[PDB]
Structure formats: structure tokens, C-alpha cells
Design a protein around this ligand. Structure first.
Ligand SMILES: [Cl-]
Ligand SMILES: [Cl-]
Ligand SMILES: [Cl-]
Lengths: 277, 277, 277
């Protein structure tokens, strides 16, 4: 199913989405370079617990349109606002994962929380990944991000194999917490995304969200794996926990970035406890 | 192309279908966990023989919508009735394979045969797979089916590799009657189906069709491989042949469940003989 | 996004297309058995240089409909005419690759060049691949083409692995100019195309375009790799260069048929020089 969020030349920009179940709406927002189907272990647990689960594919990924425009978090937050206004959701829960946590913060800051009950940040990028003089807790300098763009442009297909080795910590988890076949599914999903979004999305990951975080005025959850090699915990959740001390804060020791699959039981327990509160 | 069969929350439930050729309509219904494209060796032979071939992807599979509702044979038969009424088919032939043979029997029993010339059951599940006191010919107890649901929920992607080894009898047929690349295609098609249908469909396979079978009042074909490890012939076609002795009955010695590919010549010969009669 | 080009029984024949950028329109037409996404290394360079890039999937391939009718170059040229008339393109550049160069010549000959600024033929099939008495420069006799049809019908999935070994010259280029993952993407794209188009398209490759070539009355580029094992250069571009001596003519020594990937820098340099002229 599709929601139209914009236009590019002669074509509409349509996001693929799904809407399942009955109950309070929970909107699940994926990250690079996957799709809404990557939430399947959480969607099954939320449907059995009595929630309505909405997932969509961000622009440039999954089954959504693949424009060459609008790769910035303000546009990703506008796309989320169109999804929530078109479905007319109230008392919704926004749950972001990985790089999809950028539009959760930017939506709250720009559009406010009238439709929102709670927000959750899983393996998040906040508050500001770029290491600069005024941000010593950043993870890396600009050259690191330019390097990821040059590797995607050189051969995105081979890039995804090295990316998923560090996303799931395959040297530790292949064969035990993730199978070869689930990794193959993730590679197929990345290869179906748009070529232009794959090389443009890395330029958004050094957006500064420090001014957005104090605008969060609803209950929040911050969850992160301490073995994350993609978004290191010392530069992301441990700094975010100091900026937003009201949030529930959960560290999953040893988990990688791709913990929605590898550590699904621990993620589901923490999400269900936060949703019931 | 799509036919709408229902609605789920804000979305429509749409089935992907194709409509090719000129002649008497033959509707081909696949089984778990494939799609209408799995009939390609039969569709090519039926098109060369002068038939119109309609294939569709059942709800939850292939390119169709992926709802979390309606996984029962009465709904699958309602979806088939919507396809036949929307296309306004007359004198049609219904050909089911594998678990898609359940809605062929349930459609005939609920809706009757005014639009139907003939029906065919290939590698079928009838009459009632569950072994109970009143059904000693059933294949297995309830716990077997619950086990398949728990294995799909644990990791559907790795489940499909073991499933296809027994679906095609790969220890006998890999390299001779089926290539590694055709198996890879089947895994890709299973992984594109919906996560909720994959774990829900196994709970429909122990439906009792014994009261539906005496309502079949048109010519019928029953075909099965004697090497089927998925739906064993002693619990399915040999018992169905006693319940419906009017049907043409064809055993293909040594063929597995996935015989539309591995034994396409023998299936096509038997289908073309039955269609011309 | 989709453009409707025809109807087959109850369904429309829709071609998937994309429309990116701002500038003079450049329409990129792929060949067998890929899709418009195979132009990604050229589309990125044309977008950075200031052109509007339109790509579409030919009937039977990629994300387009999969009819069982209309596999001939006059219909493929009609589909291109519908794309150009629906988008109302003017001063457009048509760039064909591989077997998609047949509809570029047939469009110009049948419909004329009022909408067209320039045309380009990359790894092309012209002027007439069939070796006959009146065409001694043809590549092969009829039996060669019938053989490719019989190999696709026997098992298209395994056919694509041997096809891509000669399309990319993998014995020379695997690991250096093309990765295993980019080859896997190309196999996935071929397997998503329609089964009927895969076996029908080979019967179009021996169409005679000798009467179409003198109707080209706009600037043209002819580019080909001298290591092409799919469409040999001695039977195609070197004969076309004598038939159309006005065209710019570029040989890329040692490049295979799949040179849009393996030799993207040399293709992009020659395309950008021809577009600026
Ligand atoms: Cl992203
Ligand atoms: Cl099923
Ligand atoms: Cl072709």
C-alpha cells in the first residue's frame, strides 16, 4: 500500500507502508539500508500484545519510490508527518531504529507532539555524530563520512557485504544469533533500494540534533547495544542519556547495531515494558 | 495487475494476477510458500496448446498484499470467488497445487460449480491431514503442525532452506532434475512473502475437507508423486482416490512434492489429456 | 512509476520508469535481460553533469508487466513512442544498450526525429546479426538463435549464470572490474523478468535493420567493446560504422558486452563528450 509524500518531475514520490492489528498505533521507522520488513520480530510481538503496527519504507528504500531529491532529515520528518496526518493517528508511539531515529527527533522538534504519546530511540544516532571542537563526544571527523559515500559509489553491492559484517557482528553471531539466510535477505533488501539514496543517505548522518532533543516533552526510551560497531555507544546513547535524563535507558551488553534480530527477546521485553507504562 | 479482495485497516488487500492467452480459462493456484510464477513450465505448455492461463498470488505470498487477517480456507475460497467473479469466467478449469488445493475443494463446496468445467488436484492435501481417532489415515498429530509454526517463527529464512530440501528431494534431484539456480529462485520467492502468512499458513493445513469432497460434481484429476516427503501419498492421494473414485488418478513414481518443476513433462502430459477430455 | 503502453486480456501493459534531474532529457534503454537500474553508473554521472535522466524497464523485464504478446521491435518501438509522447519530451537524446539498440533504430525509422536531438548505440546489434547469403557479415546462422531459445526454455535460471559469464567476461573481470555481488544483483534482476519474454526475446535479435539505418538523420554515437562475446564487434559495430560513417565511433579495447559496469569511466567520458557536442 502507498502514501504519496511528494512529486519528482513527472512522477509521484510514494512510500510503501503496512497497517496491521487493532489497538494503540505504534509506528516503526527503519534505518539504512533496510525496510519496514526488518521489524518482523518486533511486529509479531506487538501484534500479539494488542497494538496496531504501522511500518513504512523510507524514501529511497525498500518498495518506496527512489527519487534523487529530498535526502535530509527535515524532508524525512515531513514524510513522517504526511504518514501520520494521512492516517490521522492519535496517541501514537514513534519507534525509530538506527538512522531512522533522526526523523523521530526532527519531527518532534518541528511539528510538536499533539499526535504523540511516547517516543523510542533504538540504536540511535543522536545527539551529533560529527567530532568537532564544540562536540568532542562525536564519533568521527567529516572524512569518515565522505569515505562511506565513496565506497558506496564505487560498488554499492560489494559495500553492503562489509557493512552487514559490522552491522550484525557476524564474526561473533553468524550461526548462532543470525543465520546466513537472514543475512542474505538483508543484502537483497539493501540491493533493492535506490542507487542515489544509498550514496546520499550517509551525508545526512552528521546532522546536529542537539537543539532538537530538549523539545522532546513526552516519555522516551533510549536503548542501545554495547557491541555496536556502526553507531558506537560511547558517542551516541551514553551522551544522549545525559541530554535526556528523563528517558528510560537500557543497554544490552554485547549486542551489535542489528539487535532487532540478534537480540529480539531483550528488545521486545524493553519495548513492551515501556509501552505499558 | 491486481484484484482487490478485501480491506485491512487503512489498506486494501490486493492479489497480484496475470491473464495470458486465448481460449478456455485455466486458473492455476499455487501453494506454500511460492507464487503464481512457480507454474511457468505448465503455463508455457498450456499457452502453446491454446488455453487462456490465469495465475494469481494467494494472500500473503508473492506480490500480493500481506495482511495479518484471513488465513483460513474459507477466506482463501472467498478470494478465489472474487477472482472468478471479477473476471467473469465461465467454463473455467481450476487447477490447484500443494496447499492451494484446499481452496479448490472449499470453493466448490461453498459456491458450487456454475462457473466450473473441471477441477484438478496436484500434490494435494485432501482429505484431512490430521491423524485423529476418527481419521486413522491422517499423516500426523497436531504437534507436528505446531512444530512447523515454531520453526517458521524462529527464523523463516533458515526454515525455507530445509523446507526446500524436502520439497524437491534435493538429495536425489539437485543437479539433474533441478538446478541450484532454480532452488535459489524459489527461496527468493518465499522470502518475499509476508512474515505473518508464513507462520499462519501451517495452522490451516489440518482443515478437514471430508465433507467438501462429495460436493465435487464435475470431472476431476488427482495427481501425486510417490516420493512426496511434504504431503505423503499414503495419507493424501491414495485416500482421496477412494473418496472420489470418479476422478482420473495419476501417480508419478519417485516424484517429490515440487513435481511441477522436476517432473514437468509427466505433469503436462497428464494435464493436457485431462483438459482435452 | 508507470506508463501504460497497451492491454492484454483483462490487464494493462504498464512499463516501470523513473524520471530524475533537471536539464535536457536523456532516455536510457536497457537490453536483455536486465532493467533500467543497470544504467546506475551512467545515470549518476549524467545527473551530476546537468541532464534529466529517464530510464524504463522494457516489456517483460524488471518491474514492468509481463505480457505474452508483442515481442518484436516494431512493438518495442511503439512502447518507446508512448513513453516519449506521454512525457512530451522534446530535444531528447535516445541512448540504447545491447538489445535495446534495436528499438532506437526502429523508432527513428518509423516515427522520425521531430522529438530527437541525438542517438547513441552502445554494444549494439545493428545492422543485421543473421548470417545469410546476402549478409556475409552476420554473426551466426538461425540455428544459433534457436539454440538460445531452447536453453532458456530448459531452465532460464541456470541459463542466466552461463549468460552472465560471457556478458561480463568473468574469467577476466571477476574480482577486478566486477564483484561477485554485482553479478548476483544482475542474476536477481534477470530472474524477476517474465518467463515468456525471456524465451521470446531471442527470436527478435535476428531482425534486419539495414533499411532503418539510412533514416538516421541526427548526430549519432556508436560505441562497442572489442572483447564482446555476446554481440561480436566484427559483425556489429565495425559493419555499422561503414553504414553510418557520420557517427562518432569509439572502440573500447578489451571491454566485454557488459561494459556499462566494467568500463564505466570510458563509457561515461565518451557519452559526455558526445552530449556536449
Ligand atoms: Cl539513512
Ligand atoms: Cl498455504
Ligand atoms: Cl531483448
Amino acid at each position: 500500500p502507498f502514501i504519496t509524500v511528494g512529486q519528482e518531475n513527472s512522477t509521484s514520490i510514494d512510500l510503501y507502508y503496512e497497517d496491521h492489528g487493532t489497538g494503540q498505533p505504534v509506528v516503526l521507522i527503519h534505518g539504512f539500508p533496510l525496510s519496514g520488513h526488518s521489524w518482523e520480530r518486533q511486529s509479531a510481538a506487538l501484534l500479539d500484545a494488542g497494538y496496531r503496527v504501522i511500518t513504512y519504507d523510507r524514501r529511497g528504500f525498500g518498495q518506496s519510490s527512489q527519487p534523487t531529491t529530498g535526502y535530509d532529515y527535515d524532508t524525512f520528518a515531513a514524510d513522517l508527518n504526511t504518514v501520520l496526518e494521512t492516517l490521522d493517528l492519535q496517541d501514537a508511539v514513534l519507534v525509530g531504529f538506527s538512522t531512522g531515529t533522526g526523523e523521530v527527533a526532527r519531527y518532534v522538534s518541528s511539528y510538536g507532539t499533539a499526535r504523540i504519546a511516547k517516543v523510542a530511540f533504538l540504536a540511535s544516532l543522536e545527539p551529533f555524530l560529527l567530532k568537532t571542537d564544540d562536540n568532542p563526544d562525536g564519533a568521527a571527523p567529516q572524512e569518515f563520512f565522505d569515505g562511506i559515500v565513496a565506497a558506496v559509489k564505487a560498488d554499492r553491492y560489494a559495500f553492503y557485504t562489509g557493512f552487514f559484517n559490522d552491522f550484525y557482528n557476524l564474526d561473533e553471531n553468524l550461526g548462532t544469533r543470525i543465520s546466513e539466510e537472514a543475512v542474505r535477505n538483508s543484502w537483497n533488501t539493501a540491493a533493492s533500494g535506490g542507487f542515489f539514496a544509498a550514496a546520499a543517505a550517509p551525508t545526512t548522518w552528521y546532522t546536529d540534533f542537539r537543539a532538537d532533543i530538549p523539545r522532546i516533552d513526552v516519555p522516551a526510551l533510549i536503548l542501545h547495544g554495547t557491541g555496536d560497531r556502526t553507531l558506537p555507544i560511547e558517542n551516541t546513547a551514553r551522551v544522549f542519556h545525559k541530554a535526556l535524563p528523563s528517558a528510560e535507558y537500557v543497554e544490552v551488553e554485547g549486542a551489535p547495531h542489528g539487535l532487532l534480530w540478534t537480540h529480539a527477546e531483550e528488545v521486545n521485553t524493553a519495548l513492551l515494558a515501556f509501552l505499558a507504562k
